[PDB]
């Protein structure tokens, strides 16, 4: 069974710690990201999520609130184990940037991918 | 300031209630979908996420774990409030479903839209 | 069945002509967006895409080359008709944006949607 | 400089091979997928771009009209070049399916990404 709990990076070499899963499947956890708008003011930020519980490859999504600009990115997934246990997450990613008013909001979403292994 | 708790309706005809945001921006609720690959298994699901806080029109994220499938979806978008304090949710979203194995992820995220407007 | 010949214009204001369609199911044509990262800038921009022809409500792609930016955007949708004959074309978006070199890839993929009626 | 002319594969093992780049940036191609919705009927597709032509590492986008089914790609991106003068394109697309009425739209798009290198 694939359990988000414990340490990961992806392609890009970010990190991010997710700490234990609920009966419900929610999770929280951190994340320090290797690229951003403006990466010297990158902060450690905290996530929140859900992943599927009975299924041994489970979907799942998680929020990060960037602690160090206005945006916020959503994640989701699912996490595969290998013919040799080896456990990958495959995500896509929507980044959502602040604008000042509606007649903005065209702009405003970027999308993305990330494969993420575990640290250890 | 744009509020998220309350209820809501998109476009679509789906509704959601969101519960008391916290100190951290964090909130939970409960979304019923008008819209599925099988519709007569709807069942209501549970959403966790996080809006920005000071911001007077925040993004924010959530995730909701589908509890009648094996799928998960993702939104992020952001509050806007118009001059008469009409507010608006304008949203994307990616839909992830639950793939055999990793051979077939490239299919497995269906993305999308959606505004939402406040229930009364 | 539903035609992309014409004039069409967006939700946001946009708007576009495409030509005639061949017996491939190919076309060109011309945009005037209502939108852009520089707005001052805006002149026409050309596009070229594919329908698919048998088909009563066929889906399609085009491809916009900006004309005063290094950008591109590809449009995907599905041109539907309703009981009255009204048609409305369904499509969601990715504008590409230029970057220095592949460490700047992530940020490079903007997403939305947008619908389109007929003009007259 | 950067022409998407040439044979070229992704990281699915999918192939496509572009003609001649006019000056317009335009240029026509086949495109043999490994992987589709229903993969015992894929056929050599046809494609239609457009990239920039002025830049060293343009973006671009292209359609593709699958032969095989009602459904309908669009990739957009941009060619990068190394310092040692290896070539790659970075791509997102959205895959549009064909859906019987405006009640399914919501459903009918896929998204994803592909990295390419040349055949040879």
């Not at 994340?31 to 003011?41: C, E, F, I």
Request: aromatic letters at 12%; one cysteine or more; hydrophobic letters at 35%.
């Amino acid at each position: 069974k694939c359990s988000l709990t414990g340490k990961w990076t992806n392609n890009l070499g970010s990190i991010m710690t997710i700490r234990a899963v609920n009966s419900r499947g929610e999770f929280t956890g951190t994340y320090l990201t290797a690229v951003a708008d403006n990466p010297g003011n990158i902060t450690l930020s905290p996530l929140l999520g859900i992943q599927h519980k009975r299924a041994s490859q489970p979907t799942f999504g998680f929020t990060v609130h960037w602690n160090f600009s206005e945006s916020t990115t959503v994640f989701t997934g699912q996490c595969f184990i290998d013919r040799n246990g080896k456990e990958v997450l495959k995500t896509m990613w929507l980044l959502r940037s602040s604008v000042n008013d509606i007649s903005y909001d065209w702009k405003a979403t970027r999308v993305g991918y990330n494969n993420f292994t575990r640290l250890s």
